[PDB]
Design a protein around this nucleic acid. Structure first.
Length: 204
DNA sequence: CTGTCTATTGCG
DNA sequence: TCGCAATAAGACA
């Protein structure tokens, strides 16, 4: 519980390394063995009026009844499995927060990526934190303020950039997700896979 | 009626 | 290799 605090205007997150190399390797191995990713029609989204396969693999796990929707795609959560419960329980232990849902994004290499968005779901519990736990290759994670994007922005607030390491936890606390977009940009020189888990408190 | 704010490619 | 600008339109609300 030594945390790096990430502060900017309307930005309140914190970052720590939860697990040492050997433990994070074991957890990564088990994630690779056990996680089942969506394919085909459940891996296409619509943005700007055009449909695309997502440039990564995704999976959702959580309590019965929950659903998760973004960009024209609805995902239903698979029942919890031991490796995800273990990570969930550790994260809750260390933060005092609870979660009933996890979105998993796997980036096979640096060309897999995710575009800019806020985690402002309707189904998301108002004011609840999001716990982002990473395994595998380090990848750069980028926060941009809502008012600073476009050719002429309302304001020019500085972008915030963090490398997210193997075994790390990034807590995204209110009001981070009302004011800041985030993304995981392409990093061509990264050749190895990364699995990210974002634990959330969803409304049934 | 008003009026929307979102994955890839094409530059530089 | 990288980050930014440009990118439908109609079914909502």
């Amino acid at each position: 519980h030594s945390w790096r605090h990430i502060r900017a205007e309307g930005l309140d997150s914190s970052y720590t390394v939860l697990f040492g190399k050997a433990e994070a390797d074991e957890i990564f191995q088990e994630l690779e063995k056990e996680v089942e990713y969506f394919t085909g029609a459940l891996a296409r989204v619509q943005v700007f009026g055009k449909w695309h396969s997502v440039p990564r693999k995704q999976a959702t796990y959580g309590d019965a009844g929950l659903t998760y929707t973004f960009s024209g795609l609805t995902l239903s959560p698979k029942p919890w499995i031991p490796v995800l419960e273990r990570i969930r329980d550790h994260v809750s232990g260390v933060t005092g927060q609870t979660f009933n849902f996890v979105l998993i994004n796997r980036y096979k290499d640096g060309s897999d990526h995710i575009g800019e968005h806020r985690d402002d779901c309707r189904e998301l519990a108002p004011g609840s934190p999001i716990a982002s736990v990473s395994f595998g290759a380090s990848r750069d994670f980028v926060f941009r303020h809502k008012d600073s994007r476009g050719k002429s922005p309302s304001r020019r607030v500085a972008v915030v950039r963090l490398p997210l390491a193997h075994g790390s936890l990034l807590m995204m606390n209110h009001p981070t997700n009302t004011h800041w977009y985030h993304s995981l940009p392409v990093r061509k020189k990264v050749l190895a896979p990364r699995v990210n888990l974002t634990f959330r408190k969803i409304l049934l």
